[PDB]
Amino acid sequence: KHLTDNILQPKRSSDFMAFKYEYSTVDLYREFSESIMDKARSEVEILESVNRQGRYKPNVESLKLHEVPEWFEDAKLGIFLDWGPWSVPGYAPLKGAEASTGGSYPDWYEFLMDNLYKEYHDEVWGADFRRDDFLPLLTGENFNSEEYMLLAVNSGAKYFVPFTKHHAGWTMWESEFTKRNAVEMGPGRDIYKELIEAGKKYDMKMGFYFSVSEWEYPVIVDQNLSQWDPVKNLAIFQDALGQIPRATPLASYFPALHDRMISGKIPVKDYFADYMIPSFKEAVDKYDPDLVWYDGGWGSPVSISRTMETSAYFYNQAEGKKDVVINNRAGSSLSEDDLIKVRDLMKIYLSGQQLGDYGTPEFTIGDVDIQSKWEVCRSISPAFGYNWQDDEASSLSGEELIKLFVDIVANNGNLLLVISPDGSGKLPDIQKDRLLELGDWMKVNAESIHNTRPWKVQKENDKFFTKSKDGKSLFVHCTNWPGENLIINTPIEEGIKGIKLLGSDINLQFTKASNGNLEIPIPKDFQNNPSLISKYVWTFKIDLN
Amino acid sequence: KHLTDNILQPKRSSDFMAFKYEYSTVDLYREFSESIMDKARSEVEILESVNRQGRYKPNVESLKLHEVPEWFEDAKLGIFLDWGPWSVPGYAPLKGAEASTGGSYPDWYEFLMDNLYKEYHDEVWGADFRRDDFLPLLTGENFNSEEYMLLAVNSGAKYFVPFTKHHAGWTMWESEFTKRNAVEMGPGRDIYKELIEAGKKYDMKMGFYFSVSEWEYPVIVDQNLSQWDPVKNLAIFQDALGQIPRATPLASYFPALHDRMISGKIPVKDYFADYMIPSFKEAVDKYDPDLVWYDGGWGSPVSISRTMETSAYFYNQAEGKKDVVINNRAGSSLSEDDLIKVRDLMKIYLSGQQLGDYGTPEFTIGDVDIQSKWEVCRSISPAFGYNWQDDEASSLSGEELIKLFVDIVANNGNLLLVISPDGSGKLPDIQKDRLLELGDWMKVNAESIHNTRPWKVQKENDKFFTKSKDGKSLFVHCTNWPGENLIINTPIEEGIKGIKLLGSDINLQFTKASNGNLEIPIPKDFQNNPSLISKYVWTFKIDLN
Ligand code: NA
Ligand code: NA
């Protein structure tokens, strides 16, 4: 049904024993809650003071004055490291479980194991195997931060975004605000510190991926919620993050249900003020990222989540130090009344999406505005997170990946390419292969990608265009080998100085027909094996007067 | 912590395999939903026509005019048969899991196994053992309907109320509106029909216990609820019945989560109109009960649940045939506005409790109005439903039960005594012992209980009074043996014709002291061993002029 005898399929160990962390949720309440809330209050005061004195205030109009940095316009390619406890089971259906994005989500396994993936989980892992039993299996024994960074450098990428904290709240950094962190649970290392250090050594821009909301969080309450509640003054905070209907804002807390879903999380009174804001601040202050990649901002509107304050802080602390950027996932600017009207009834929803420097279409590019900056995120397959089933049949070829990349870049996009390791931190050879092919292609063709801008036309048949910033170099990316002759129909107004195929030093002949078309004879010597010069896509650089 | 080697503790069998009912929820949608909704629509039309033409209308003012029948005033003792799939595990904590009533609830195990009782369940039954895996174990191999009816008769009871349908929706009767019924699942018999036939044979008034709401019900919907929903047009209806915060009114339906919680339930569009009303009507029409014992009426207000229509129907179909009664659990008459104000903020809640013929204090009697009719429900322990742990330390003695019963009856109450069999249908010996003592007491003393009314004084020291309905007999229930003389301080205005101790034919002489006290010498031959005549409580019958 779901359990195979395939060695590649991660499955329950014969030596499985329940993971009961040193501190229960109640232990954390008794021993750490007051300490953390005290620390949080002092950190939030500091952040609020920075914003009071700073250029950027926590409001849409102030934050809108921030500009996309040159480096982000220029980067074109980033690497998105989708690694966390979900990497251990490494499962989504190959087909039929797609979200509205068109992607599938192995990286939602921690949540979906109780519902959509429950049949699989029960057969492969066991009904008695809880979410947190994946944490000790996230060993990282094969995870080498510097090698991942070198892989990204070699691929042609210009930024690297680790999944620093996803929806179940495990932090890749050693945080003072949670024990659900990479040092205490899983690999026993500050993975983010290692990646940040590697990024500095290889001169790579570094992101900070941060889920605003979490699926469940233990909170301190005055009144209990039902006559059945076993533990006074604790409940479980839930917002819209899970998407499926749930109890909101509070569910009754039951240790035998909840503890092994929330190991390490310290109860607080106010999820946002006492935990989310100070942990954001901590990571920014300690690691100094170039980019914030919010996610999970649909949990609560920003009036509640207070992400305009984290955004203002990020920009203010960067002033005079570095150029930084934020995606568009902080959350909604809608009022309670407009959120009600959306539920009762997309037009109104989009009117409330007003925060961030760039758009983030996911998997499906769709109807992007090419006049503004955007970034599409996806892996080589539909899967966000490792899928042990992913293979040649399910994944883009190197060829397809390169052609998609070119299309993205011509249309003003960046590609944020997801790579998804297994529980040990090993990258599947198929993903490594596609990175190698992209990198090998970029070694020849990168000047037509990095630091370019859209042209007046993006596409002509099988050809995609980019231009240099100054407009004096036009790049024609042919996704089919043009053979004996390259003909360009789109009018070129300026005089032409010369033409070359990237990967060859030889200057090409060229003439303008009277109808305006460009004719470019291709040397016979290239026709035998054009892939020797460049594989899959052949890029011609046209120098203008 | 919870799994013992005690043979009395019900636990997972070594031969366990998942119960996957021959009809899945989706099968029932495809194969039965249309037929059930066809029948439902016709039955609702018929019910509405009966109410249009009948004396009682489905509104508070009309229903209030219905009076408690003489038989219910007279009955004093009923048997409440708390038997269902929960009887198999037979568990609640002996202490510390009490509800607001003061009772504990083994009969909530099907719901609480996922939260409050989850540690026990996981250890004793297994996380892979689902709610519906209890249904095949409800064998009824030791359940004999005639014997249960005779147990009620011999105990002195005058009505018998089986748990015909509790909160998870298993019906004791063979229903065309659900396959979660006693013929298709569990004992393979129409249990209710057997009890109804026995009740007719032994001239016992019969109840119909009916949970208005159910914890979960599969419903047919136009739009799905999330991008993760695997099955088009099905969802799970939930209201306030579960008490703990939940998704309401709809949860996303996931077969691997829900199917083994809702085996047998046929999806409908409108839980109330397409299932609740017609199933109520079916049982009333087929079995002709004398009493409706609503429960679980806190799920939805009556504006939504439509229980004023089922109440009017019950009265109307009985009118001119038999005198019938309804408890006070149909639900709330509050408006949406008042329900909101209750949630934001007991006074308002009680103002909306306006339907029914009598009050139903549960376990805790509290400050009852003795001028109106009331009925307390409880077992001999705090436990509603079988608790394998219940023992002499946890349970009222026969002595304590009889004294409590006398107190109830002197104060205008009925006792609806809960008896709780195990999964096979066997009654625990401790419960049998208490029934033996109560029945032996009633064989001597029942004339002082049945057909009586409160007197002008209810209690004088250790003495409780009742009077015959005709006013010609006063019964003095002494909870301590009076010894050589029975002295009654309360004035008796009427002349006295004769006095006897029930259980003895001896006519007792008496004098009035000058202070007015009645002085009744007690024969020497009673003094050594008065318990031979009657145990625990001695009742003197005073015949008046
Ligand atoms: Na801006
Ligand atoms: Na009435």
mmCIF file of C-alpha atoms in Angstrom, chain A residues 97-101 105 108 111-112 114-119 122 127-128 130 223 225-230 242-248 250-252 254 256-257 260 345, chain B residues 97-101 105 108 111-112 114-119 122 127-128 130 223 225-230 242-248 250-252 254 256-257 260 345:
data_model
loop_
_atom_site.group_PDB
_atom_site.id
_atom_site.type_symbol
_atom_site.label_atom_id
_atom_site.label_comp_id
_atom_site.label_asym_id
_atom_site.label_seq_id
_atom_site.Cartn_x
_atom_site.Cartn_y
_atom_site.Cartn_z
ATOM 1 C CA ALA A 97 -1.784 16.110 -3.472
ATOM 2 C CA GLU A 98 -0.776 19.371 -5.169
ATOM 3 C CA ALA A 99 -1.600 22.667 -3.463
ATOM 4 C CA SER A 100 -3.145 25.653 -5.281
ATOM 5 C CA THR A 101 0.446 26.579 -6.329
ATOM 6 C CA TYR A 105 4.780 19.592 -0.066
ATOM 7 C CA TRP A 108 4.264 19.924 5.253
ATOM 8 C CA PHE A 111 1.277 18.778 9.859
ATOM 9 C CA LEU A 112 -0.251 16.551 7.129
ATOM 10 C CA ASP A 114 -2.325 13.687 11.007
ATOM 11 C CA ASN A 115 -4.724 14.020 8.040
ATOM 12 C CA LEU A 116 -3.811 13.996 4.315
ATOM 13 C CA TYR A 117 -0.722 11.760 4.753
ATOM 14 C CA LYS A 118 -2.087 9.762 7.730
ATOM 15 C CA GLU A 119 -2.497 6.446 5.855
ATOM 16 C CA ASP A 122 0.452 4.893 9.929
ATOM 17 C CA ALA A 127 0.415 5.756 14.648
ATOM 18 C CA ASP A 128 2.493 5.800 17.850
ATOM 19 C CA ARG A 130 4.693 11.386 16.691
ATOM 20 C CA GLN A 223 -9.025 31.050 31.977
ATOM 21 C CA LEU A 225 -11.192 26.538 27.707
ATOM 22 C CA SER A 226 -13.259 23.511 28.776
ATOM 23 C CA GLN A 227 -14.267 21.346 31.716
ATOM 24 C CA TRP A 228 -11.921 18.657 30.280
ATOM 25 C CA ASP A 229 -8.695 20.721 30.324
ATOM 26 C CA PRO A 230 -6.107 18.826 32.448
ATOM 27 C CA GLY A 242 -2.804 25.419 8.851
ATOM 28 C CA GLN A 243 -5.365 26.414 6.136
ATOM 29 C CA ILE A 244 -7.746 23.606 7.111
ATOM 30 C CA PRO A 245 -10.451 24.714 9.587
ATOM 31 C CA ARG A 246 -9.244 24.503 13.203
ATOM 32 C CA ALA A 247 -10.058 25.858 16.655
ATOM 33 C CA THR A 248 -8.884 29.497 16.661
ATOM 34 C CA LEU A 250 -7.124 28.654 21.123
ATOM 35 C CA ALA A 251 -7.368 24.902 21.388
ATOM 36 C CA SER A 252 -7.506 23.052 24.698
ATOM 37 C CA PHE A 254 -3.673 18.036 26.338
ATOM 38 C CA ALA A 256 -0.609 13.348 25.638
ATOM 39 C CA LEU A 257 -1.749 14.886 22.343
ATOM 40 C CA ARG A 260 5.221 15.357 21.183
ATOM 41 C CA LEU A 345 -17.344 36.243 -0.437
ATOM 42 C CA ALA B 97 -11.310 13.900 35.476
ATOM 43 C CA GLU B 98 -14.694 14.978 36.837
ATOM 44 C CA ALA B 99 -16.875 17.234 34.680
ATOM 45 C CA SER B 100 -18.699 20.297 36.048
ATOM 46 C CA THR B 101 -21.507 17.940 37.216
ATOM 47 C CA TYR B 105 -17.535 9.924 32.082
ATOM 48 C CA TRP B 108 -17.166 9.958 26.719
ATOM 49 C CA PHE B 111 -14.267 11.322 22.131
ATOM 50 C CA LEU B 112 -11.744 11.713 24.984
ATOM 51 C CA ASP B 114 -7.927 11.466 21.366
ATOM 52 C CA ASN B 115 -7.143 13.970 24.167
ATOM 53 C CA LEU B 116 -7.839 13.584 27.911
ATOM 54 C CA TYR B 117 -7.674 9.738 27.874
ATOM 55 C CA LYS B 118 -5.048 9.492 25.099
ATOM 56 C CA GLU B 119 -2.164 8.266 27.299
ATOM 57 C CA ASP B 122 -2.209 4.515 23.616
ATOM 58 C CA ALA B 127 -2.573 4.474 18.875
ATOM 59 C CA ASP B 128 -3.545 2.419 15.791
ATOM 60 C CA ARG B 130 -9.466 3.746 16.398
ATOM 61 C CA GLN B 223 -17.411 24.111 -1.865
ATOM 62 C CA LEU B 225 -12.740 23.942 2.765
ATOM 63 C CA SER B 226 -9.019 23.881 1.938
ATOM 64 C CA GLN B 227 -6.521 23.166 -0.817
ATOM 65 C CA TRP B 228 -5.609 19.934 1.083
ATOM 66 C CA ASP B 229 -9.110 18.396 1.012
ATOM 67 C CA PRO B 230 -8.839 14.990 -0.760
ATOM 68 C CA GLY B 242 -17.569 18.402 22.107
ATOM 69 C CA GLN B 243 -17.141 21.358 24.564
ATOM 70 C CA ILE B 244 -13.427 21.692 23.766
ATOM 71 C CA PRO B 245 -12.708 24.297 21.048
ATOM 72 C CA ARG B 246 -13.028 22.816 17.544
ATOM 73 C CA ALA B 247 -13.506 23.817 13.919
ATOM 74 C CA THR B 248 -17.177 24.827 13.560
ATOM 75 C CA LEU B 250 -17.163 22.450 9.309
ATOM 76 C CA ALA B 251 -13.907 20.555 9.451
ATOM 77 C CA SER B 252 -12.040 19.307 6.382
ATOM 78 C CA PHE B 254 -9.868 13.269 5.546
ATOM 79 C CA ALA B 256 -7.656 8.283 6.915
ATOM 80 C CA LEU B 257 -8.566 10.392 9.960
ATOM 81 C CA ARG B 260 -12.786 4.987 11.477
ATOM 82 C CA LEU B 345 -19.119 37.190 29.395
#
